[PDB]
Ligand binder design. Structure first.
Ligand code: HEM
Ligand code: HEM
Ligand code: HEM
Ligand code: HEM
Lengths: 142, 146, 142, 146
């Protein structure tokens, strides 16, 4: 469960990254596809999976849109992300191992661009946030 | 495992760029703070009451250096990592009973510490080579059933 | 999140075991210690970990004592197991993989006695219950 | 891995009690029901949209049986499980990218199905040997790094 401290720190980071948010998502995705090629299968119906392609760029915006919704719904992630849960956990049957993969790639990208934001304590809140997003997204599995 | 030239040279390059004591200490601190159940494995390593306590713990700085030098050992034995780690595997599994998911947690903390230091140079292809290396390392540290 | 169906399957099972709960707790803890010796470290302060001995017996009770409490508070496990979460996740720093192991051994002990109750859909409900118990116990880690 | 005489005898007699079609079908159906994301790996298997659909699907029955016969290859070759499973590892990891956590989920379903059939005969000691066997199989099915 996210504390008030964790929510402040998440919202803060989210304000820092707005200008780059679209780009953060696009590259994080390129990291996931290259570094964890077990995930490629979920997106092979696109036209191109390369780090800078039109489909990766477009989907990276969409991921960051969903995380923005998460930030909006931070007080109740389970209720707030339910349509995305139905999509990921029921319709697409995304293996839950994959959610932590994406989260990690997002943190890696955020760290490469925002090194000073990543104190242990801040990273703890970010991790709790991404863990809670994944639990929210897992609601509709079963 | 079979290394391409890029993988082999990326790995050597990354470590050549790391301060083992600085990166080691940050990495282990990061893991005990972000994933606090990992503290239990380090019960006789001084005060771990809180973030700032882990951060100023001389023993956690010392052991982070040890981990990094342990990793450097694999970098020096890239085509014999399993055998190189056979004794470490037995310690971490048979004596210490470290749940294997903790190896991945520590690995992830290291990557993020490395990411924050190298910045844009720590690319997807570079993280790819680094993850492959950590995967091999983690696999060699886990229990050997074969 | 547990459906009304899940809560109902779980309460019915607990209703069915009631008689033998202490015993089930005993044998299931004895399974964990033998089948997953990585868990012995938590209980080495006793001077008999061997199953069938009083420490396993007495502790098997309190585990099942802990689950019936959990069953009683099934509508909000987070709140209902706060004190136990403080003890497990905070004080003892129980590695979370371990909650999964004990849960498994409890199901296995039950399976051997209540085979008819282990239909796929009932097993799923049990497994959602134990997962939610583990998550509630995990609350006070961070 | 050093098998005790008890472990060898136990694994052999567990498997001599199992009807590979019945147990294999039930195990796989159980896995697709208790952990429904595993379905995505068998996307070309028919109606998996409901528990009653999975239960009555003959593709699942067929493949469930195949799983048990693959296990049998390890039962008949208890000292050479890694090599016996080399091509299976390539299939599950390199070709089909099955997240390794699922091997353990399936193993756990098989355990619970065996426990239910065998009853009191499935003691802690018996479950000890069974899990050791499954641990070795699962390690062998995972990606080989060494
Ligand atoms: C941080 C966790 C995640 C968030 C917030 C997220 C967010 C979103 C959003 C907002 C969409 C809407 C796009 C649509 O309707 O097609 C979407 C789609 C999708 N997601 Fe996720 N996602 C996450 C994780 C994952 C993971 C780990 C995978 C698989 C490895 C995945 C696979 C997909 C796929 C295949 C689509 C549809 C893509 C397409 O058809 O172009 N997602 N996601
Ligand atoms: C890539 C991962 C790791 C590497 C390369 C590594 C390496 C090492 C090395 C070289 C030692 C010294 C062993 C000796 O004294 O002979 C050690 C000890 C130890 N490690 Fe790890 N280790 C790793 C992960 C972990 C993790 C994840 C944990 C627990 C969360 C852990 C817990 C311990 C403990 C408790 C000791 C002994 C400390 C003592 O002597 O008091 N290790 N490790
Ligand atoms: C569903 C899972 C679990 C439940 C319901 C549960 C419940 C309980 C209860 C009611 C107690 C007694 C508290 C007291 O003495 O005041 C206890 C103690 C304890 N538990 Fe658990 N527990 C669970 C999982 C675990 C696991 C997985 C481990 C680690 C292998 C563990 C290790 C311990 C230890 C070391 C104690 C204290 C022993 C003692 O005072 O004699 N527990 N638990
Ligand atoms: C105890 C662990 C397992 C064993 C012993 C096992 C065994 C087998 C065997 C013998 C085959 C046939 C290979 C051949 O054609 O020669 C197979 C195929 C396959 N397995 Fe596994 N398996 C295991 C776990 C899993 C899990 C957990 C999944 C998914 C979560 C999985 C997914 C598949 C798929 C998708 C195929 C190919 C099916 C097709 O033809 O479409 N397996 N497995």
């Amino acid at each position: 469960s996210l504390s008030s401290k964790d929510k402040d720190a998440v919202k803060a980071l989210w304000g820092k990254i707005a200008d780059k948010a679209e780009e953060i998502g696009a590259d994080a995705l390129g990291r996931m596809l290259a570094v964890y090629p077990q995930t490629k299968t979920y997106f092979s119906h696109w036209k191109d999976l390369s780090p800078g392609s039109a489909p990766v760029n477009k989907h990276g915006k969409t991921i960051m849109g969903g995380l923005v919704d998460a930030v909006a719904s931070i007080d109740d992630l389970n209720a707030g992300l339910l349509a995305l849960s139905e999509l990921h956990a029921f319709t697409l049957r995304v293996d839950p191992a994959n959610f932590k993969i994406l989260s990690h790639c997002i943190l890696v990208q955020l760290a490469v661009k925002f090194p000073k934001d990543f104190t242990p304590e801040v990273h703890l809140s970010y991790d709790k946030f991404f863990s809670a997003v994944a639990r929210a997204l897992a609601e509709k599995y079963r | 495992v079979v290394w391409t030239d890029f993988e082999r040279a990326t790995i050597a390059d990354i470590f050549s760029k790391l301060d083992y004591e600085a990166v080691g200490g940050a990495t282990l601190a990061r893991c005990l703070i972000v994933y606090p159940w990992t503290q239990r494995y380090f019960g006789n390593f001084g005060n771990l009451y809180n973030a700032a306590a882990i951060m100023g713990n001389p023993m956690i700085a010392k052991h982070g250096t040890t981990i990094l030098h342990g990793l450097d050992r694999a970098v020096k034995n890239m085509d014999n990592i399993k055998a190189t780690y056979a004794e470490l595997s037995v310690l971490h599994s048979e004596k210490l009973h470290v749940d294997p998911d903790n190896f991945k947690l520590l690995s992830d903390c290291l990557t993020i510490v490395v990411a924050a230091q190298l910045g844009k140079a720590f690319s997807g292809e570079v993280q790819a080579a680094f993850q492959k290396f950590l995967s091999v390392v983690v696999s060699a540290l886990g229990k050997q059933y074969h």
